[PDB]
Amino acid sequence: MTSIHFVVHPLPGTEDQLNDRLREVSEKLNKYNLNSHPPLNVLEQATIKQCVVGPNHAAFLLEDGRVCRIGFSVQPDRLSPVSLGEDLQWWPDKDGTKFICIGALYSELLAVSSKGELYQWKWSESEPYRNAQNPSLHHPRATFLGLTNEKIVLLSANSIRATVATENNKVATWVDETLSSVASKLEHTAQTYSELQGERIVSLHCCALYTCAQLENSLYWWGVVPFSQRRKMLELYHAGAVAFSISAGIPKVGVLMESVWNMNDSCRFQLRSPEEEQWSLREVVFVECFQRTPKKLCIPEKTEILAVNVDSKGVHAVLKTGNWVRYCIFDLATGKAEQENNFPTSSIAFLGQNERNVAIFTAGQESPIILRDGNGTIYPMAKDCMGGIRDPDWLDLPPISSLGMGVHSLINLPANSTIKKKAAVIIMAVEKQTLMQHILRCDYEACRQYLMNLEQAVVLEQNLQMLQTFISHRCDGNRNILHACVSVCFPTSNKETKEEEEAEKDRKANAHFILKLLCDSVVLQPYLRELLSAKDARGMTPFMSAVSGRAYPAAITILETAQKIAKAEISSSEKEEDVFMGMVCPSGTNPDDSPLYVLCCNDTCSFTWTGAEHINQDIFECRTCGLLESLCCCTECARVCHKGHDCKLKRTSPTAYCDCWEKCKCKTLIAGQKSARLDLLYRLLTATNLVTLPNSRGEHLLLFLVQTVARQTVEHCQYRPPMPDHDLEPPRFAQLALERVLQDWNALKSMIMFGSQENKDPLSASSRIGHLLPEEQVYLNQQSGTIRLDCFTHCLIVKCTADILLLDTLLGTLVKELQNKYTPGRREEAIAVTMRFLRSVARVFVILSVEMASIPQPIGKCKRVFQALLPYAVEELCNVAESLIVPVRMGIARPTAPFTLASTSIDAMQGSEELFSVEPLPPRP
Ligand SMILES: [Zn+2]
Ligand SMILES: [Zn+2]
Ligand SMILES: [Zn+2]
């Protein structure tokens, strides 16, 4: 059962207004109850195969061959939105013949039946045309087209022209009866093109001027030569020509009497009766330079083709190469790929369950493009400041069984109004998924009654076909019921976070109760593993979506549910850790999409604690979003925002105040619950192994946290206490995160033993050495890396001169693991970790002491570290001095220039910053 909806989109418009109309339909489905029409209720209980839109009428083709039509009127436009006709009447079918295809022209409605008969119905006439002389003949031009001796299959209809095709590779075309005067030389009857032989034509799509035929592995076009190729023809039109235009929703034929020299202007055409207007030459095609032969489009070899639709801009195609999907726009001037675009989401989620649901919908020249993916949902397309596809914002819509749109022209416009003349009318037959809509409407009672009814039905009749059909239910962006519940559970306001800072509807609660009800459901137990281990269009599980969307109690509930389910299904291989990591953070995942890393880098945006001020920050630039000249963004914007974009850091940074909300939707303006965030960090530290995996910049979590702390200490001291809200405190989470992570013998071990043999850094040249000579592999495997460890030690000691607690935390963890005579192998492991850390501390201390003249705070911190670990620091300092004194005694010292010492401490820090804050050599691409 499906429901019918009407969308009015005035022309000319952008994709943003169309997306706003689709969104308005989406919340009218979601939060505005339900509404329909009396005469369309009979259409709701059947599978509508095809919907077409005429000038003032709409036609529906069903599965059983019944065709119905209705009238409508659209008043408002732009500087229910439609009025429907009172009664619906059907096609007279006393002969009992079912119908296969329908199509809409301006003056007639076309039908193709199973017996190969073409039927024509006038819009003005209330009864379909039947010839009295020939009872077996029904189309008035069937004799002229010569289709009476061949069974007919494929139809394509548009505003003025129609193109039709048999089984015998015979294609014909004609124009509407309102242009019968110029219909002597623009058309052709059924030929047999030898160039199209070899493969059956699988689809035909007609534009307003030309038409296209898609075969099994080729594309051909024929018809009117486009306006871009008229430059070479005039590389200048004499008077006396006869032309036609389709402007303002009406087709008209005129005659020229001026001489034309420049073709970029507008010309005045004398009107011709069907038995004197100023028209632009871009919408005028001279008839009395026509591509009467099919021309092959250039496509790459071994590429499957999915959906073809044509318009004035060219040929729009979806191409599949291997396991990848491109979107292509072909220009008819050269026949090559004019525009090539890659989808910003995953291709696997775009392919969906079935590849036959991918389609492209358009209505004419200026009409927009609606793309339908493999799941039957709408993929919203928009253009960024560059020439790519913007990141899509999901509409939360059910899949569409049938979609059809057309161009309508408004009637009797006043002369003193700026209302646009033309619009597009879109008709949707959206499916209903009742528990999906119950989840999206935030109602606990309907979900509870549905689960109780399903449990009673399984207990009584033992039927699970409806349940296994409901498991495969999807929303937009490849989202299941759990994904929809998580997306509903996102925080919206900052009221609780605003009120907790002092002296220091019911949608959310119903959503949480719904999540608990589906988590503790008895009947949903054998499918919750497949529900939780599913990836959406961004490649995230519901736990990853709850972490990234700042829904922390939802992530806590999902984590307990995964821990409960995973312990009862070990049995065979693919064991407990494999099931748990499949549910939490699966393999083949980007390192910047880890739940621990994302949980660490979700901080409050800097406009929330700085208004229109001009404090000193770090300034990032996006090429994609348009933050180019004076528009800027804070560092948390570069972390959470702009993750797949072309975002860079500018060295010449003046003062700015995060102009990120002006150009895009900043995802960091709202802070979630702090206690649930710390509890999630506590649970993720002691249950997974996500802390030993670096991010896409090759940084450990400890290095990222200490760099965030060292940046925020400098940035947050210029906060003055009293369009988005700017009355919140600066974020304090990274200090507590460092204090918790440093109390762990996995993170400290992986940080200190970084760059060793059993630790791979993706941005190091020594990581990928398997294709080299064996001697070079020996020379590269002799050494070990200590760049990032030295950077971490320098950032902990020199750049963190506002706290001491992290150093005592690290020293306490080291001493506690050194005094552990309980588990085997712990003591020597802690000894080696202590040796590596003391080597790094000794190197930093030596550099700082050489740079200073004849105590500073970092030297005091190094002395405290040496005093807390005396019997090993003495030996490592002996080794450091021995290494320093070797080249003097052997007389092989490298000559250097003299330098002056440092009287103050800021210049020594400036000189040691350039020595330790470096990067290893990247591998060869
Ligand atoms: Zn951006
Ligand atoms: Zn920001
Ligand atoms: Zn931002």
Q: What percentage of amino acids are in beta strands?
A: 15-25%
The assigned structural class equals: alpha+beta
Shape, per Cα inertia axes: elongated
Helical amount: 25-40%
Bound ions, cofactors and other small molecules, one mention each: zinc ion
Number of helices: 27
Over the alpha carbons, how many angstroms does the gyration radius reach? Answer: 35 Å
How many E-type strands?
32
- Could you give the distance between the termini? 54 Å
Task: Tell me the major beta sheet.
Answer: 5 strands, antiparallel
PDB class: ligase
Keywords: E3 ligase, UBR5, Ubiquitination, UBQ, Ubiquitin, hect, ligase
Entry title: Structure of Dimeric HECT E3 Ubiquitin Ligase UBR5
Name: E3 ubiquitin-protein ligase UBR5
Q: Describe it for me?
A:
The chain contains 27 helices and 32 strands. It is of the alpha+beta class and 925 residues long. The longest helix has 26 residues, at 826-851. The strands form 9 sheets. Strands 2, 3, 4, 5 and 6 form a 5-stranded antiparallel sheet that branches. A 5-stranded antiparallel sheet has the order 19-18-17-16-20, with no helix packed on it. The protein is elongated, with a radius of gyration of 35 Å. A hairpin with an 8-residue loop joins β26 (359-361) and β27 (370-372). Helices cover 30% and strands 18% of the residues. 31% of the residues are buried. α8 (481-488) packs antiparallel against α10 (507-519). It starts with a strand and ends in a 9-residue tail after the last helix. The structure holds zinc ion (3 copies). One zinc ion binds next to α16. It is classed as ligase.
